[PDB]
Write a protein that binds this ligand. Structure first.
Ligand SMILES: [Mg+2]
Ligand SMILES: [Mg+2]
Ligand SMILES: [Mg+2]
Lengths: 126, 80, 154, 96, 205, 98
RNA sequence: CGAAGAACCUUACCUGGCCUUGACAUGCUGAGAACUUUCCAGAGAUGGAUUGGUGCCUUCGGGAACUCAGACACAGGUGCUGCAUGGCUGUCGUCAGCUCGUGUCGUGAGAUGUUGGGUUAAGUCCCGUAACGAGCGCAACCCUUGUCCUUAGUUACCAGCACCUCGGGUGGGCACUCUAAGGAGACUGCCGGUGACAAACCGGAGGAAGGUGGGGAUGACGUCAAGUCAUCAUGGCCCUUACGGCCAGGGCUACACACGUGCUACAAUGGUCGGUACAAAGGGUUGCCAAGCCGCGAGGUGGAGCUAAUCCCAUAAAACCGAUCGUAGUCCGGAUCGCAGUCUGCAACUCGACUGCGUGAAGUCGGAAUCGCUAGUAAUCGUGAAUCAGAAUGUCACGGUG
């Protein structure tokens, strides 16, 4: 059919993104988009790959995201929807490889090592 | 501390060496190594030889000493 | 010291549509408190629009270029005499010198209602009576006494 | 059926010793399902008299593994339990 | 300094000497059995050289495979020691005990068997090097591709802690792919305590 | 010492000897519906027992070595006998990791 | 800093009380089965009562089992030596080196290989060359994280399907997320330039990832007679009517001072009150200890569920929203201290942790000096585990915002 499955992970988050033709229906975990992400700039960051590919009005969007942090789930959707947009063709492939959206951000947290206190901070001597 | 469900505390051998030693009245000090027990209104006015750690020191029991234990009246450390 | 350092980029300001303001927002954030610092920078942005009818980006565009300096000293010691050399400030560097001078004088403004401290700083530098502008021009005066050491044992 | 052992070169090599040796006798047994793994870290000090910042840290694992029958009609695996236990596999029975 | 050459390869080269699963309520009640078995058996089998004592636990009892390079000393006149110990391993380990004995053909290619002979020679007042130049070439006529033997200790001297070091062939130690044996048996002379280390390198992969 | 393992062996006997009356004497006291006359004479039976019966007098030492500090209860070993016995492949399921 | 837990116990030290083949080992001589004694004296150690028990294999002779006494060898030692030593760890330093065989040069100690040009994270490579080779090391082999594929669907999963009381609640489904097994992927491979066109170097495309992708384990020949005889093992030396054993209380937590690390603060990027949003990782049948329930509150009842992707630990906090607070030693800060409580334990005096109420200090960003850190990093906010009856501002470990 026209249902399109999109996943995306960033900072231990995971978002199921479904994409199908509709009229601006943006719903996440049975919540509105302005209601879910309370008072942040990432309310527009989830639209940034969408408005780049000039399809902001032409699809239903159904998002289910689990785990992660507050602004880590918003990055999971942004990576998640870019994989769902490229199930169509590779016309928007070059519009997103150049945009720097398709690559999953590999930067994950680092473990505490013995002798040190943080991942790299160490106590003071004299 | 020592919540009121378990109300009092006194030692068993101390009690028979006091309650029977009331019936023949105060003609001797009571030499006792125990320090974990309180004093009681059954014991107002006695003479106790509480163990310092290396000797016994005498105790003049008064009426307004009732809640505090024997440990507050024997010394431990000198600091002259 | 093998040359290593690549470039990382931060450019995001959706609620106003800017690029210089986002890099300026990072010089206000303390310990990752971004959402706190975001509403203070907008909190000192709307007071300028309350004050001046012009778009307060251009007030911020003018206030950079009267705090941003041109030349500055560089104490390169010859190894037996401590010298100082007036050097041309690189064009990439000269943005961050003003934005870092601006915030540190806002914190010693000594007012109430913290967004009013930064509000008065961006008003003065469109004129020149700010303490950041007075700190700018004084270091400019340090270079011409230093100008004898410009090329010679430099 | 549930299985507990200490290394995946036994416990995931004894399920085929049960899946083949029960589906042969007619009854249907589905594919085995993995579970989450027990992981226990043990950081121990290493010097006899003290030098604290020299340490060494180990980890003991426990692999789990769950089978699933469909139609119970075989007591064949009930006799073939001493065969399917080899060295360090424990099998608690849940004959679904 | 030179982390133990079994503890880095439990996995890609070698396996444990004892396999049994235990719950968290009985895990520390099978270890104290299996650790005073090995102190018992080596004190009895001081001769008839022993390299490895494996223990399996099948369902509810036991199994033990004692390895000797001379099984006829232990199985002497059809198990006069086998059934005698099997009565008395149960007295330390309440389960019924199996005892099984294999051979260690090529006894000069396992490190425990070699290093027990070094303590024997160096307590007969043999020279510290004539004992060991011959204990490496004998273990190089047949078998291995590299041998290190360190002999450290008093070495006869007054206040002397020197280390003999002799090597032949190839011995890697930072390759996890390889296959290395290791053993430390000691020696009590009439003065001092001599410790001997052995690094027999068999074939790789 | 060796004379010090021996005196903390018999503590393990005397705790596991009585072990049942002290459950009953602490069952009497812990009830809010219990009468204090049934509590006060129950206090008598506790203090007239020898004091080496509580678990707080018991001290879990290492079983092969005897050293007090550095004991784990998922094993029975010390801090520094556990290392020498694990590098020899004895302890099953135990490896290094990261 | 040993110490991953000093109320006693631990514990070695102090004051006493008290033992002498001994708390424990083997050999000897006698004695009784072991056991149970529910009792007094005494701070206890111990001493003396003490209903009872009379086994067990029997060539039926006794044997072995335990417990008591006698005597001998002895036992025992946290007593000295880490410069008599083994074992195990720090250090230079994860630094790029360190040596041998044969050969030739030198009367010899030596040297050459291992130097030269280029290059590299690298004694890593290429071209050269009286040296030709080999080993240890570096690299790779291992783990983990990031992409996809296959095998797998309960306790996990809800796209499609009905169902519903609207809770995947239920039937159901094997699409998925997830979990864990097994695989592919990355090699300067390809494009261009550059070099002796030879190693390599600078750009480029594709790609989840681009030039050892990020992290971890892995530390050569050696050094400092570095540290430890108090973890353990041992040569010697001393004690053996005590330098060894046993039991009470005390002590290590004392206190004009000086130094080391660490936490809060000094405020308005804050302080309170009222709502409201999202985690990972781990422990739990000698335990977790729910619902209900009574308490200003720490808690008390209450007993489920549970041997664990099921049940419980268990409510993440910062962020956001509204309110007041107007920069005042303060609706700042919380030390001290009075009073009142609960919990564990035989026992909170010296000496535990928390709770209530009251009081409210120093402190207004801190000299000369001096240390940490190059990216999911510093900075800031919480959570868990080990040790553990009780007791973390430390240690180890996992995530938010950045
Ligand atoms: Mg440099
Ligand atoms: Mg060299
Ligand atoms: Mg605890």
């Amino acid at each position: 059919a026209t249902q399109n499955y999109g996943t995306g992970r960033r900072k231990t988050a995971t978002a199921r993104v479904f994409l199908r033709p509709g009229t601006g229906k943006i719903s996440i975990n049975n919540r509105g988009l302005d209601q879910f992400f309370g008072r942040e700039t990432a309310r527009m960051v989830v639209r940034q790959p969408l408005e780049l590919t000039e399809t902001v009005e032409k699809f239903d969007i159904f998002v289910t995201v689990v785990g992660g942090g507050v602004s880590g789930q918003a990055g999971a959707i942004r990576h998640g929807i870019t994989r769902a947009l490229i199930e169509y063709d590779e016309t928007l492939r070059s519009s997103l490889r150049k945009a720097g959206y398709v690559t999953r951000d590999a930067r994950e947290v680092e473990r505490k090592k013995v002798g040190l206190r943080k991942a790299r901070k160490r106590p003071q001597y004299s | 501390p020592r919540s009121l469900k378990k109300g009092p505390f006194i030692d068993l051998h101390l009690l028979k060496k006091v309650e029977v030693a009331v019936e023949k009245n105060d003609r001797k000090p009571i030499k006792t190594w125990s320090r974990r027990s309180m004093i009681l209104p059954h014991m107002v006015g006695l003479t106790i030889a509480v163990h310092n750690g290396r000797q016994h020191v005498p105790v003049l029991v008064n009426e307004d000493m009732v809640g505090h234990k024997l440990g507050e009246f024997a010394a431990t450390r000198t600091y002259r | 010291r093998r040359r290593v350092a690549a470039k990382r980029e931060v450019l995001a300001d959706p609620k106003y549509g800017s690029q210089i303001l986002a890099k300026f927002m990072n010089h206000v954030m303390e310990s990752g408190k971004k959402a706190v610092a975001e509403r203070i920078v907008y909190g000192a942005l709307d007071k300028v629009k309350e004050r001046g009818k012009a778009d307060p980006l251009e007030t911020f565009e003018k206030a950079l270029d009267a705090i941003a300096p041109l030349v500055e000293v560089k104490s390169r010691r010859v190894g037996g005499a401590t010298y100082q050399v007036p050097v041309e400030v690189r064009p990439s560097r000269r943005n961050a010198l003003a934005m870092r001078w601006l915030v540190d004088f806002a914190r010693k403004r000594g007012e109430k209602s913290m967004a009013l401290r930064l509000a008065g700083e961006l008003l003065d530098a469109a004129e020149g009576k700010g303490a950041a502008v007075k700190k700018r021009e004084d270091v400019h005066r340090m270079a011409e006494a230093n100008k004898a050491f410009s090329h010679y044992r430099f | 059926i549930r299985l507990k052992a200490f290394d995946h070169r036994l416990i995931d090599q004894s399920t085929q010793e049960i899946v083949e040796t029960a589906k042969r006798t007619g009854a249907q047994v589905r594919g085995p399902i993995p579970l989450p793994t027990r992981k226990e870290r043990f950081t121990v000090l290493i010097s006899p008299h003290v030098n604290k910042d020299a340490r060494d840290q180990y980890e003991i694992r426990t692999h789990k593994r769950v089978l699933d029958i469909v139609q119970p009609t075989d007591k064949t695996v009930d006799a073939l339990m001493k065969l399917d236990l080899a060295a360090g596999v424990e099998v608690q029975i849940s004959l679904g | 300094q030179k982390v133990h050459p079994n503890g880095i390869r439990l996995g890609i080269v070698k396996e444990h000497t004892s396999v049994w699963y235990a719950d968290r309520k009985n895990y520390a009640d099978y270890l104290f059995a299996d650790l005073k078995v090995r102190e018992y058996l080596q004190d009895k089998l001081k001769s008839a050289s022993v390299s490895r004592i494996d223990i399996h636990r099948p369902a509810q009892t036991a199994r033990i495979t004692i390895h000797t390079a001379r099984p006829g000393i232990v199985i002497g006149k059809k198990g006069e020691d086998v059934e005698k110990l099997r009565q008395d391993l149960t007295k330390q380990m309440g389960v019924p005990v199996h005892i099984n004995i294999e051979e260690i053909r090529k006894p000069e290619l396992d490190a425990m068997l070699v290093a027990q002979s070094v303590a024997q020679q160096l307590e007969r007042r043999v020279m510290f090097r004539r004992a060991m130049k011959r204990a490496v070439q004998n273990a190089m006529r047949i078998g291995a591709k590299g041998i290190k033997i360190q002999v450290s200790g008093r070495l006869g001297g007054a206040e002397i802690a020197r280390t003999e070091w002799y090597r032949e062939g190839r011995v890697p130690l930072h390759t996890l792919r390889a296959d290395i044996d290791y053993a430390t048996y000691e020696a009590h002379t009439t003065y001092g305590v001599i410790g001997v280390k052995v690094w027999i390198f068999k074939g790789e992969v | 010492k060796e004379s010090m393992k021996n005196r903390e062996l018999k503590r393990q006997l005397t705790v596991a000897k009585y072990a049942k009356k002290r459950a009953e004497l602490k069952a009497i006291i812990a009830n809010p519906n219990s009468s204090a006359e049934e509590r006060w004479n129950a206090q008598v039976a506790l203090q007239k027992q020898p004091r080496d019966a509580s678990a707080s007098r018991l001290r879990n030492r290492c079983r092969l070595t005897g050293r007090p500090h550095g004991f784990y209860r998922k094993f029975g070993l010390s801090r520094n006998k556990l290392r020498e016995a694990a590098m020899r492949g004895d302890v099953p399921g135990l490896v290094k990791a990261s």
